[model samples]
Target chain A: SLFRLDTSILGTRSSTIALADLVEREWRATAPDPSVVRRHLGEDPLPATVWAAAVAAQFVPPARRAPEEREALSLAAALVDELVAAEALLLAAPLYNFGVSQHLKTWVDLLLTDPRMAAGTESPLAGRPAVLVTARGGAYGPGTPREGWDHAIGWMRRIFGDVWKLELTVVERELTLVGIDPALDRFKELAERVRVTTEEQARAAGRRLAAREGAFLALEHHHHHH
Target chain B: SLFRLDTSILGTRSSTIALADLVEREWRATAPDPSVVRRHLGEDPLPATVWAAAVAAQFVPPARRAPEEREALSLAAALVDELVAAEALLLAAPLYNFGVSQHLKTWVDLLLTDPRMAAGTESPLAGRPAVLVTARGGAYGPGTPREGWDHAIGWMRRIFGDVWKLELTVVERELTLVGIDPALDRFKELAERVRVTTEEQARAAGRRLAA
Candidate 1:
């Protein structure tokens, strides 16, 4: 129904781990294990094969190019195939130094290139849904002083929602560290709220997937008839 | 009194050029001629020698470095020598995409690695006055809608001002293609005021230069 890409490298104790656990608890859906993909496909093949398999089972790999060029091409190829295959995409990304990790940025760069995911009249990967789960260390939110640097989510919203015509839902985990406030209870409550919201959204997205599949099948049948 | 590096390859008519022109016009000082330095010094001696000559003789050589490791090293060596000889720095830079030019960023990176420019401590470049003349085609100022990508100048300010202890000033020129408005007019007026302030600051720095 949907593909989940976990970009954070932190192990089991990380906030991203907590968030993923909550999503699993709520959705009861299979999330592709990145470690398994890495072991099976190797580091280089994972981007192409994993992304391709998630989108279209029968999709063939494109002609190989240099590493950078292949990264771009694979992402472009997979975006089209994936949009046809899955109804939605879920991305879990943790902020690194006030910005998205270079890893995630590379993925985004691949997606934003022309003739692939660009939407509107001539879009290849248009009218899909994407949900972003973001976790950050600092407390800067809506009206905070240093919230100006919080461009990670905003940039994603603009590129995916506006440019690619994807329905985007964002869940931000703000003030992740303890001792931000003297009382740890308030921090715990806020963290729980973020976890609950993300889980609910993931479940709702899973439910919507069945309907999307039915609509897609009907469209495919009509196309075959015509 | 201060050394201004013009890295805008667009020549005159660039926003950085306009700011440089304004600095020259309002400050009652002469802009260093890099070509004149090239004429005197051979094709390349060192950046420090050229930069030192620029402050003392008001001439700077044409030294350009590609974004490679070796070339960046040469550029850093030159700039380090020049910064050591001078009291203050003024750099004219234009935003390329969402970041500073590869050339300027490379230079800053070189400066950061130098032992003499250590962060959060007294260093050779510390307590010096530096000004950044920045220009962008878009209207993304601090706290604007798409301001997240404009971290180039913000990072530069933090590195130079807070970490290096340099008294820094930013002259931002936004919305170049969009015709001038009252806000733009105010910025122009502010630019003139900054020029006067920096000139006096430069003169004071010259008096305090380590001779």
Candidate 2:
């Protein structure tokens, strides 16, 4: 099963959603239907107080936990269960106010509260294939006015790759507001080129995901024969 | 009046909380009875759905906004009202999962939804002195193994300094878990030094805040 988390508040208007949709479409080419566990954070956000409650619960024994704390703990466990059951992952995150989206941050924070996904523990998702589809409204590359402004991508990479140990592939698209914001009219041509390239990269990454699965299944068959 | 935002879930045990309290104490030195407006996010977080609703309100006519959208809009406006009324700002934010605190992020996002705090507009708090007191458990300094792992401080700087145009001063303490987590015990000596220096810096910054 593929675990997909979409945190774009813009819904149909989100660049991240479009890119992630392309990736998902390509991933489905190997089969007519695939088992997908979808978590739409924008439509239905997790409780902001859950993380603190879950952390507070850790200080007390499970048997003596408060009702709220127990509920929070169970919710965190459920979040981890979804991850553990997934064969691959897709995260559609967007940049908000020059930083990571609050929705995505809250979700990740709650995930860590789970013992299965805690720091220094063996991650159930270790070495699993995952794709991060992210977009920023403006450019943050070197030579831009806001060179270090794009803070969402690097933090996501550290969490998904270094911490969670996901075999992660990132497909980022910048200058997403060029077409909508008339102030960026001059960069429309550049933005169009970037969109095309980013979409192609996302599709290629998706195909690789399916290809890897096929190879894994073939290897398992060979081992069984031996 | 000063606006204070505390986003630490650790309550009395938070390093950021202690440092921010020190700063507030020093700021009050100049006045026996200072007008301070406090917003404790960890204890009472804003609605997670408010920001999206407020943003949606912006795209539609005010007369046609849904009830939830209207409420979200009013909340965003009230949030900006606090900033506009304040003479200065103090943000006590703690790093979580190697990133910005989610509570703090939600607050900022809602603030931006207000027309007064929107991008490309003149910020209400422009040139006003603001102090950001933040702490992280691990070291993210240049030579550390996780040198670039600190994704919180820089982002805060960009938002407070560049986007909001605040005359910003940051007081950061690293290796905050050295005394608590045994895994970080190796850096105890270095952590002590950092603590002493950071506390002094926070106090000095606070004095400047009141100066």
Candidate 3:
């Protein structure tokens, strides 16, 4: 019914955001990591704390627990409810060092703690059309020196398409650091073309999600109407 | 010549550290992050000013700059110096969720600002021996449902081995959460076996890097 969940931290006058702009920009959360030198997702990450609270709440004599210990459960659960309620999804990311954004991964780890986001739970978001907005500063195509170096996009496809089972589309741009870094100036035109393609794809996504037409999930037609 | 770069947020307590320590315990190199969660490497970010300066310097003629603007560049250059000087290289990472540690990624991003790390630059460290030390909570071997999902290893192999062009060795262990997490208690013995293998591999790594 909507561009459901939003995520990623590719905000550096970032190319990932360029395409993601056509999709959900609001309500995307940040898992803040304070240091660049020593990265930590969190002290007691929300997922752990949330799962921690759930684990302790079990096999114990009935006793009051601290709010801090239990809050992430409610928060994570509420987030899922908010996520599934949306009709569509857009997860944006950039290739960082040949992988997906670590900021993005931290958030995914937190979400997966809730059974709904983890494996074996029924995929509630299945069949919802979703977009994977991605960008890479360099080309890693076959024959390129860094071929097969893109870890972010492939792993992301699995998490969103296979695990969570959202119908997925990936819109990606390569060699994006072209203009900013004169070293890549020769490919400025190629990068522009890729950027344009991503934008066009994003517009298509906005349209498809907005229409919510029968062209979407085949099984939904028998039970649904706007 | 050994240049060991670590990106795990959990240092001593981390399996990545355990493997990397075997190598770095012998290297003259820069070391590295993860936050026990609170330690997400983002706690201290790159000085936006120098980064900003570089972004500016990239387009415009590089003539004048500030201590803050060029500090990261000098620092990045120093890192390159350390890297090229070494005969061996090591990158330590933890499989966070299903991927490589982000802290490791940040360091790479910073280094890329220097031309030595970007495209078209010759890799002075090419053919150097290197190790990628990694750990994961669960198994990702073939036939496992999470098979082919350890994104960190492939990317690291490509970046360090293919692009950075070091002769790469990977020291990895899976099922790390077995003994610690109650849910994986069933895999306790199997995990122990895997751990023994990892330690043996670490010893080999140490011997290789040490020499």
Best by DockQ: 2
Candidate 3 local lDDT, A1-226, one digit each (tens): 3432333332346565567665542212211211111112211122222333443433333347456435644565665775677666666666656766545664565566556776567888887777777777778889987577787778888888777888887777788788778867888888888877778877776655554434544544576666
TM-score of chain B of each: 0.60, 0.96, 0.82
Candidate 3 residues B1-211, lDDT tens each? 4555655544346787676666665442332221111112322333323333443455544577655556767866866777766666667677765665545654565667788887778777888887777888888898888888777778777678667888788888889889767889989889999988998897787676655
- Count steric clashes of candidate 3: 36
Candidate 1 lDDT for residue B122: 69
Question: What is the C-alpha lDDT profile of model 2 across A1-226, one tens digit per residue?
Answer: 7888999998789898899888888878863346678999998999889988998897688999999999998999999899889888989998888889899999999889888887789878887899999898878789999787888888998989989899998888988999788888989989999999999998988787766666666773445543
Q: Write the per-residue lDDT of candidate 2 for residues B55-134, one digit (tens) a residue.
A: 98888898888999999989999989999988889998988999999999999999998988876789888999999999
Note the residue pairs that clash in candidate 1. A55-A82, B47-B78, B48-B78
Task: Give the distance in Å from residue A31's predicted Cα in candidate 1 to where it truly belongs.
Answer: 12
TM-score of 1: 0.48
lDDT of 3 at B33: 21
Residue B125 miss distance in model 2 (angstroms): 0.8
Ranking by TM-score: 2, 3, 1
How much RMSD separates candidate 2 from the native structure?
3.0
How well is each residue in A26-108 modelled by candidate 1, as lDDT tens digits?
A: 33444332111111111111232222122222223444334545554555666556555655666676764444443454455
**Runs in model 3 with CA error above 4 Å?**
A1-16, A22-85, A106-127, A136-147, A174-198, A213-226, B1-3, B10-12, B24-57, B60-68, B85-87
lDDT score for residue B102 of model 3: 46
**Deviating ranges (above 4 Å) for candidate 2:** A31-33, A216-226
What CAPRI-style quality would you assign to candidate 2?
Answer: high
- The TM-scores of all predictions, comma-separated, are 0.48, 0.94, 0.70
lDDT (10s digit) by residue, model 1, range B78-157: 66677766555666667543544433533454454444653334667777866677776556755677665564576556
